[PDB]
Symmetry: C2
């Protein structure tokens, strides 16, 4: 997990404004969640061939579809996999008002076929420490909510929850982690999309997009579900299902 | 339906700032949606003894609870009914990105016991015309997201969708209706709460709270699921279940 067959290329432009375009296929866990009609409404991350992790506030149902291996949403020519969802597992501690514990697992009806462009992100262990100031990466097609149709990426630093509260106040709970406010927007992250940090040569899922600045401010950090606080629930869910 | 045993009293103060406190029990279809722990996160409306209608973006589950007959959330002394949810029916056309078709039905495990303070709002027919400029009423505990603990009410006019787009642009779809921008906030409406209009002596559910001004501006209208566009789905769901 966490080792893309096509290595990402992150330049200085990933750190400013709205980030930059990713190398095609270099974020191979990145999936698109689409409705029956093919409308993209959220992101997610493959954690193995049968399971995708996304945000609970995406409200995914078994009539939505996971699309893996995508780079250009405007293309009908690239190799993609449209994967049916068998069952949706929303974390029972999710609260649609506070948006805390904002995580949902999707079990696919049939396994994805992993490849150079389709593979899994690593999960952290509950006890991993991702220190404030660590540079991490968010990817997605979130800029299409407001514009490039190809997958974007931005590099941005984790904040301490204390410093995040200077921006978002009592909205920030222990099961959340913030990143950004460093001169780049977080808006390229789709709801439910990944925030990944590289430790020991492997990209690890540290956050899941919950919400960000309503104006995509370069000085307001994004807010993410804190995966270390939720990975025990993830592993219990996989083991029981 | 739509005829409260305790008649509402709406004064001029319902039309300005943040509205006014309701007469206790005078909005008897108004329910509170709470999690297992008793935390209020959304509103809804009883449409009979077995069914509550709310917003799809509330993400209600069968472990949440419907609380009927409530006036003061800070009181443990008033007669309320805590009702378990048997099954949740989210409209399959709901889209968590656009927030269109934002309606969910809750079927209760055991019927509410209707009374002077607990009874049903009327549903419109699909073909009813609620003209722009009609004065309607939104009720709820939505101000507690930011403060009074008792049920509030505000009187505010429906907008045409064309005029609503002057505020919210392409966010406004045919299955939405807007109200407000007349000198009063819409923020007293909980997510999923009622927007009711009085025709022929009966209060009718015209809207369900979808979203409003992030700053509770008195000059920005609230956005509601348009019940006339969704009532056929409501009646099909009741008939099939």
């Amino acid at each position: 997990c966490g080792v893309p067959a096509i290595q990402p290329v992150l330049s200085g432009l990933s750190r400013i404004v709205n980030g930059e375009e990713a190398v095609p296929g270099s974020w191979p866990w990145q999936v698109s969640l689409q409705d029956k009609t093919g409308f993209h409404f959220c992101g997610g991350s493959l954690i193995n061939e049968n399971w995708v992790v996304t945000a609970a506030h995406c409200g995914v149902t078994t009539s939505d579809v996971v699309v893996a291996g995508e780079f250009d949403q405007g293309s009908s020519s690239e190799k993609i996999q449209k994967l049916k969802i068998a069952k949706v597992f929303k974390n029972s501690k999710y609260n649609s008002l506070t948006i805390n514990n904002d995580i949902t697992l999707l079990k696919l009806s049939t396994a994805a076929s992993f490849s150079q462009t389709v593979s899994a992100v690593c999960l952290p262990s509950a006890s991993d420490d991702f220190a404030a100031g660590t540079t991490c990466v968010t990817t997605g097609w979130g800029l299409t909510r407001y514009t490039p149709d190809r997958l974007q990426q931005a590099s941005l630093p984790l904040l301490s929850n204390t410093n995040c509260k200077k921006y978002w106040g009592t909205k920030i709970k222990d099961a959340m982690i913030c990143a950004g406010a460093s001169g780049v927007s977080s808006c390229m992250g789709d709801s439910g999309g990944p925030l990944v940090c590289k430790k020991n040569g492997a990209w690890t899922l540290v956050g899941i997009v919950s919400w960000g600045s309503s104006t995509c401010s370069t000085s307001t950090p994004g807010v993410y579900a804190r995966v270390t606080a939720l990975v025990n629930w993830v592993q219990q869910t996989l083991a029981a299902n």
